[PDB]
Amino acid sequence: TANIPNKLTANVRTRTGKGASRQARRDGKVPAVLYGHGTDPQHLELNARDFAAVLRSHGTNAILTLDIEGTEQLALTKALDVHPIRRNIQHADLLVVQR
Amino acid sequence: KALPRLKQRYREEIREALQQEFNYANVMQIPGVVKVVVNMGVGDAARDAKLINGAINDLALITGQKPEVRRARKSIAQFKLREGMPIGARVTLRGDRMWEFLDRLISIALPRIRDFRGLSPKQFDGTGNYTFGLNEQSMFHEIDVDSIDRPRGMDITVVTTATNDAEGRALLRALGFPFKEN
Amino acid sequence: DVRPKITLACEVCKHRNYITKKNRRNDPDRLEIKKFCPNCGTHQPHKES
Amino acid sequence: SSSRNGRDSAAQRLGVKRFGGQVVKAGEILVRQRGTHFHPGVNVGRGGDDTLFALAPGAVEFGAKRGRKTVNIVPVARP
Amino acid sequence: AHKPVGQNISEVRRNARLRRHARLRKKVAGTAEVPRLVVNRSARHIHVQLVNDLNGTTLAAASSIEADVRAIDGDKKAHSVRVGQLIAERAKAAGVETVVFDRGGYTYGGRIAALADAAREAGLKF
Amino acid sequence: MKTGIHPEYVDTTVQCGCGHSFTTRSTKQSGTIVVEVCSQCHPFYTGK
Amino acid sequence: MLIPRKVKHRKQHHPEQRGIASGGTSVSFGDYGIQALEHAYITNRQIESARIAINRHIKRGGKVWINIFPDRPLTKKPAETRMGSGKGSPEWWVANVKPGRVLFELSYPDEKTARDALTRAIHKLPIKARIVTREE
RNA sequence: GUUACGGCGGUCCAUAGCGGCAGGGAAACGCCCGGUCCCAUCCCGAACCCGGAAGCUAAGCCUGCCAGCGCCGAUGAUACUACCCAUCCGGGUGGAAAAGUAGGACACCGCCGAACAC
RNA sequence: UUGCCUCCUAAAAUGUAACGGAGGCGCCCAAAGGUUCCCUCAACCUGGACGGCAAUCAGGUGUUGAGUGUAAGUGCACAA
RNA sequence: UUUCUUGCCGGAGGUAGAGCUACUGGAUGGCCGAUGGGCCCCACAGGGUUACUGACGUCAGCCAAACUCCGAAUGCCGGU
């Protein structure tokens, strides 16, 4: 039926924007926004490699436990912005999944 | 005071019969026949515009009021039509005259029709109105057969407050329309 | 031609007060129309010359 | 072997002549336009060729009424 | 199971009356100095109301609903005449002498003309 | 109802063949018409 | 061949070969696809050659989709004519292809055969192009 | 002061519309009957007037609830871009777009009139 | 080809060239001008002898569609 | 200092970008389901029968300079 949520460390974003996102991607962290019924969009950086591995191992509809500075939040990858050429995850829209 | 035969019949019996048959939540739903529109579309007026005058005279004598001459809103070359060419005549009957024309049409004309076997009750609008076409124009005593000119397939329609085919047929049967039940 | 520059002159002051076009085919007869004669100081009938 | 084109009318120098906030005099042309892209608002008239002009002195403002852009003149407080 | 299908004549009349009223309002509007006399004429009563469209605030109002107008006997035109007189008096009181008359999308041949003339003889410029 | 543009309209009485009377307004100025079959005697209405 | 039934304007400005493709960048019809990696005016003749190559490599089974359509007319003036005297008549029908645009898609049971057919098509094409797949 | 009672008027005029479900007549808004009375039909008392309460809230009207259709719609990101850096690539600072999901919303106020109790 | 008008080119003010891409012209209207008032179908059904891709017609909604002296921006059931 | 630079404020745009079931011209699928040709039941009533030419519609998908439901950045016009 269900499965263990995939653990991913998602540090909050000190700086946000075009330059910040490009620098985060260069560092190797896909930027993301976590929103949902809680009504509190949070700006996170997920490790690009780990996030992509989780996505490609369990699919887009894979529930993720994001460690956001200690706190654990369940969320599903609602949308993935992926570059058509570089094929890298440009951005992630995560939706909170209250249990 | 005075009151048409069909109008009095409707005001006195038909409403109760329809209420009993199609029991309505309120009296105001009782179908009540509304304007009766009788038309003669010439079509060949493009070749003989004079036929419009004869149609006007015939409609006047049949109904009781002048027929409004209806031009064309379109110009289709296939039938030699131009914008504004008088292409038909229309009479709208409302109230006492409407009811009296219905009474005469049911009591005089349709029985006089040649080889009259009735019309199927399937020509109803689907929302409560009934349209059909008389095969000639001499059935009306006002149109004396001895001084007729040509045949005009005469369009007639009755507009009712009915909601659909069922209430429409109930109303017209109550008014006593001939119907080729099928 | 076709639409000549007709001249509307008053009937009373008989002054050629206005000039305007008119389709001679649709309106072959002299264009009689109410216009303002400044000499008369009031609207007077004007007709084509 | 030649081109059937090559013609073009003079640019009519349409558009907004006094933008939002500009103080204008009465009778001043505010918008040169074809048709009512902007409609005459308050203290603004519409010319024969669709020229929106100020009917009263004041500052030009652009508003929206019934979903139609309008040019209005807001009276300017006397100093 | 009855479902209305035809647009009722009441609804057609309301929509067309609002249509005509907006058509008139394109040119007729009320102001503090020259308010707008809106007239609402129903089959039962007639009401008039001096609006300032700048604020949307009414300065004076009159209605055939009033016990005085109801006591006034005669015809609907007589009651509309009384309403016109009342609104003229109340416009005098409010300080309004000249207004623009909004017929509300109506015609001469009824109470609107009678009310208009009542205000004329009353003294309002309408 | 317009004054004279509307054609005359007078009440009339008709008698059918089977002997049924009928009163209604019709353009006929005579006021007395003789109908043959009528709906009180037509075979379609009567039966069959 | 691929030629529009009609074009509203038959003498159009050259399609601007700029930016990466914003639409049609993923396999939406078949299992494999040919994604463009450079800008090019891919002509209807090139499209025909590529699709015929794919079809002849897959032989009997399989389905081919041609996402791009050459509906842009590139004009050419008559040979040995000087500059001027109007614009040339329509000469080629091209699809403005940008990097990231998937030009052809293929469904075929055999992965190796599908990739070889797409490679045929890419060799027929005038640009760098890779074999992308629906599985992301 | 209050009512599912009324009109009049209200916004960068759909967050307001469309549709579906449920409810109301003391007074208003309506529905409605015959042409002695102004007035009207390019014909029709259907739209506009006369006398109304014998009768009715069916519809319009308005009230409550449905997010189905429409409407609005973020943050983030991207596209794009001004300037700047950059040999061909590309990058920095600033600005920054529809879809969607997260979502919002089945609209939002004043004048006066009626009855209620004071 | 030469003057005028409309559009695109034209790079969201204006303006902007080429023997660049498209067209119009240069008339017409005394009732197609003014004013006052009013309106109202783009398409399925039932049909409406003949009269289907169409009649004179009747209803519903198509929610502002639709079409509308002569090409763009406008004007709608607030009606240019 | 009216000039110009910068900040802020008010402003109209339809370009870049896209978006097109938002219009005007396009695109792989099946669909209640258009001429249905075709088997015909053997009705000329009336009807399934559609291997194939495939209506509207619909499904993610795509383009435009003379497309726009949208729509920047700059630039421009003013004020400070």
Swiss-Prot record, chain C:
Belongs to the bacterial ribosomal protein bL33 family. One of its GO terms (cellular component) is ribosome. GO terms for molecular function: structural constituent of ribosome. GO terms for biological process: translation. It comes from the Bacteria. InterPro entries: Ribosomal_bL33 (IPR001705), Ribosomal_bL33_CS (IPR018264), Ribosomal_bL33_sf (IPR038584), Ribosomal_zn-bd (IPR011332). Keywords: Ribonucleoprotein, Ribosomal protein. Gene3D superfamilies: Ribosomal protein L33. SUPFAM superfamilies: Zn-binding ribosomal proteins (SSF57829). Pfam families: Ribosomal_L33. This is Large ribosomal subunit protein bL33A. HAMAP family: Ribosomal_bL33. The lineage of its organism: Bacteria, Bacillati, Actinomycetota, Actinomycetes, Mycobacteriales.
UniProtKB/Swiss-Prot annotation, chain D:
One of its GO terms (biological process) is translation. The keyword Ribonucleoprotein applies. InterPro entries: Ribosomal_bL27, Ribosomal_bL27_CS. Belongs to the bacterial ribosomal protein bL27 family. NCBIfam families: L27. GO terms for molecular function: structural constituent of ribosome. Pfam families: Ribosomal_L27. Keywords: Ribonucleoprotein, Ribosomal protein. This is Large ribosomal subunit protein bL27. HAMAP family: Ribosomal_bL27 (MF_00539). GO terms for cellular component: cytosolic large ribosomal subunit. The lineage of its organism: Bacteria, Bacillati, Actinomycetota, Actinomycetes, Mycobacteriales.
UniProtKB/Swiss-Prot annotation, chain F:
Part of the 50S ribosomal subunit. Its cofactor is Zn(2+). The keyword Nucleus does not apply. Zn(2+) binds at C16, C18, C38, C41. Coiled coil: none annotated. GO terms for biological process: translation. Binds 1 zinc ion per subunit. GO terms for molecular function: metal ion binding; rRNA binding; structural constituent of ribosome. Binds the 23S rRNA. This is Large ribosomal subunit protein bL31. It comes from Mycolicibacterium smegmatis (strain ATCC 700084 / mc(2)155). Belongs to the bacterial ribosomal protein bL31 family. Type A subfamily. The keyword Flavoprotein does not apply. GO terms for cellular component: ribonucleoprotein complex; ribosome. Transmembrane segments: none annotated. Keywords: Metal-binding, Ribonucleoprotein, Ribosomal protein, RNA-binding, rRNA-binding, Zinc. The chain holds residues 1 to 48 of 75 of the full protein.
From Swiss-Prot, chain G:
GO terms for molecular function: rRNA binding; structural constituent of ribosome; tRNA binding. Pfam families: Ribosomal_L16. One of its GO terms (biological process) is translation. Keywords: Ribonucleoprotein, Ribosomal protein, RNA-binding, rRNA-binding, tRNA-binding. InterPro entries: Ribosomal_uL16, Ribosomal_uL16_bact-type, Ribosomal_uL16_CS, Ribosomal_uL16_dom, Ribosomal_uL16_sf. Gene3D superfamilies: Ribosomal protein L10e/L16. GO terms for cellular component: cytosolic large ribosomal subunit. Residues 1-24 are annotated as: Disordered. Residues 1-13 have a biased composition (Basic residues). PANTHER family: 50S/60S RIBOSOMAL PROTEIN L16, LARGE RIBOSOMAL SUBUNIT PROTEIN UL16M. Part of the 50S ribosomal subunit. Binds 23S rRNA and is also seen to make contacts with the A and possibly P site tRNAs. Belongs to the universal ribosomal protein uL16 family. This is Large ribosomal subunit protein uL16. It comes from Mycolicibacterium smegmatis (strain ATCC 700084 / mc(2)155). The lineage of its organism: Bacteria, Bacillati, Actinomycetota, Actinomycetes, Mycobacteriales. The gene is rplP.
